[PDB]
Ligand binder design. Structure first.
Ligand SMILES: CN(C[C@H]1CCOC1)c1ncncc1Cl
Ligand SMILES: [Zn+2]
Ligand SMILES: [Zn+2]
Length: 571
């Protein structure tokens, strides 16, 4: 414990020896308190807002732009029967994920490029500058050699609930564990339940394939605060990925797991403004990308065990008999792969089509692993879905949409207020008119690619692309983002929905936007369309005037009129 975290703790004190204090009114019960010292929002995208005027009076849109507790909780230790189930399943799952993959270290050369290309990776101002400074790498080397020693000095978390770390520590995590993401361990092809790198244009088709299997309802239970419910028992089954490694990699990964994952150290600001230094062994404390993969892994494990429980593979979680152990092992070997194919899992989010509806009341292992369901009483059976087009997954639902030529699109969808409200927000300071416009164009092209079937979004997308210089490149400060390009959007649509779509047998390209269908007028309204409203009609008829207002603000640039791509706006 204190041997592992002390050096980190001791070092911080020294740098604040003048302002150190062991305050006795510290709000922590579950976290460990060590000492303190002295220290001390969303903007609106005007391009998108000026081109979505009817939404200026919709509170669901406008409120999205205005504006820890659950981190201080503790999950009890699972029973010995649960721990056995988890260890057997995790051992078998790492082996399956490893069959066609080789663990390997990621490199400085890999890390530098990602940073020189902008990406989330929690002396030098920007991190781009540090990656160019040898001094930094001298620091990294120092820490690396310390990790090989089984010790840690500078790998400390900063709460705000995302925990940032110094770039060097992010590198050491990426060096040891980046392979999980960089080499697509949680791809569908590889992991069977996973959907990493799939894209929102494929999730619908994947849920439809799971629906084709014989079984009961589709279950999509959320977990209440998943990250907070990760047990030390979970952080150790995740560690068993090191079993598949060798050489320096195994030691570096064992150190990431041992030191920065199974014994965290965090500096939290408390206005009461001091910087508390607290610690704890459990919960999820890693980079957002390694968090995704280890969330997917532990979720896959939990859902296979809930499936085992519904099939009566084991009678009770209190203790596993020797014959039960063998029975669990034989199940995994005989049907594990089939059972993984019955699930779509994205980090803490899942959809399971079990063998039958006994799964709905198989709750003892799930509750005892601490994966308590959100908004339903602990022992109340899960509500299942009878139609794959109603199932929630990754903040979306999916429609089946028949083109005028008979070909079948499976399209992603969500409440339109949520889509418009997110596009009206830009996170960052010092944004020029030009980069605000290019962010608006990134939303517009995403809408043309993913949400073309929504009347308001195809119209607003065409208006924004008409209002922003044709050659300005779409930007995003931080899945498959095919909308991030200056290529013609009809050409990308044909590539994503027809040519590269493995569920479309006939590869006949689409020649214009009017060949591409919409949802039913009533379905469109149900998912939040303003069609029918006087406000939306004035907006559509006078769109050229809104486009011209934004063109006048940006100035005398080369624009294209994309409005005649629609039927109505043709002369
Ligand atoms: C006004 N209507 C039809 C009515 C009847 C049911 O929905 C509203 C439109 N329908 C489709 N696209 C654009 C428009 Cl505005
Ligand atoms: Zn360290
Ligand atoms: Zn919908």
């Amino acid at each position: 414990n204190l041997d592992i975290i002390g050096k980190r703790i001791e070092k911080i004190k020294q740098e604040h020896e003048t302002s150190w204090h062991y305050d006795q009114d510290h709000p922590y019960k579950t976290w460990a308190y060590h000492g303190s010292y002295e220290t001390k929002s969303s903007m609106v995208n005007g391009v998108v807002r000026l081109l979505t005027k009817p939404w200026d009076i919709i509170p669901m849109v406008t409120q999205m732009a205005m504006t820890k507790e659950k981190v201080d909780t503790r999950t009890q230790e699972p029973k010995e029967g649960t721990k056995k189930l988890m260890k057997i399943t995790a051992e078998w799952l790492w082996k399956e994920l490893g069959k066609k993959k080789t663990p390997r270290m990621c490199t400085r050369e890999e890390f530098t490029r990602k940073v020189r290309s902008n990406a989330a990776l929690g002396k030098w101002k920007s991190a781009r500058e540090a990656v160019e400074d040898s001094g930094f790498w001298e620091l990294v080397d120092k820490e690396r050699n310390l990790h090989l020693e089984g010790k840690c000095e500078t790998c400390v978390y900063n709460m705000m609930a995302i925990w940032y770390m110094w770039l060097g520590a992010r590198f050491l995590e990426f060096e040891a564990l980046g392979f999980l993401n960089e080499d697509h361990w949680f791809s569908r092809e590889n992991s069977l339940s996973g959907v990493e790198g799939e894209g929102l244009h494929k999730l619908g088709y994947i849920l439809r394939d799971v629906s084709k299997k014989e079984g009961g309802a589709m279950y999509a239970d959320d977990t209440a605060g998943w990250d907070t419910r990760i047990t030390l028992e979970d952080l150790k089954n995740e560690e068993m990925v090191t079993n598949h490694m060798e050489g320096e990699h195994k030691k570096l990964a064992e150190a990431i797991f041992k030191l920065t994952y199974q014994n965290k150290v965090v500096r939290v600001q408390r206005p009461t403004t001091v910087m508390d230094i607290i610690s704890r062994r459990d919960q999820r404390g890693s980079g957002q990308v390694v968090t995704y993969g280890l969330n997917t892994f532990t979720n896959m494990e939990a859902q296979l065990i809930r499936q085992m429980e519904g099939e009566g593979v084991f009678k009770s979680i209190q203790h596993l008999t020797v014959t039960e152990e063998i029975a669990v092992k034989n199940w995994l070997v005989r049907v594990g792969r089939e059972r993984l194919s019955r699930m779509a899992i994205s980090g803490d989010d899942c959809v399971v089509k079990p063998l039958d509806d006994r799964f709905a009341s198989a709750l003892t292992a799930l509750n005892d692993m601490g994966k308590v369901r959100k908004d339903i009483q602990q022992w109340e059976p899960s509500r299942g879905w009878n139609d794959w087009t109603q199932v929630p997954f990754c903040s979306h639902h999916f429609h089946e949409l028949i083109m005028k030529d008979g070909r079948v699109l499976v399209v992603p969808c969500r409440n339109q207020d949520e889509l418009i409200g997110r596009a009206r927000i830009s996170q960052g300071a010092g944004w020029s008119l030009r980069e605000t416009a290019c962010l608006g164009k990134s939303y517009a092209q995403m809408w043309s690619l993913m949400y073309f079937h929504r009347r308001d979004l195809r119209l607003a997308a065409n208006a924004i692309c008409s209002a922003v210089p044709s050659h300005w490149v779409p930007t995003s400060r931080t899945a498959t983002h095919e909308w991030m390009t200056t290529e013609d959007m009809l050409t990308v649509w044909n590539r994503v929905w027809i040519q590269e779509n493995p569920w479309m047998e006939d590869k006949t390209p689409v020649e214009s936007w009017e060949e591409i269908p919409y949802l039913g007028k009533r379905e469109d309204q149900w998912c939040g369309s303003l069609i029918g409203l006087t406000s939306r009609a004035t907006w559509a008829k006078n769109i050229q005037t809104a486009i011209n207002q934004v063109r006048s603000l940006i100035g005398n640039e080369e624009y294209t009129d994309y409005m005649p791509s629609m039927k109505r706006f043709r002369r």
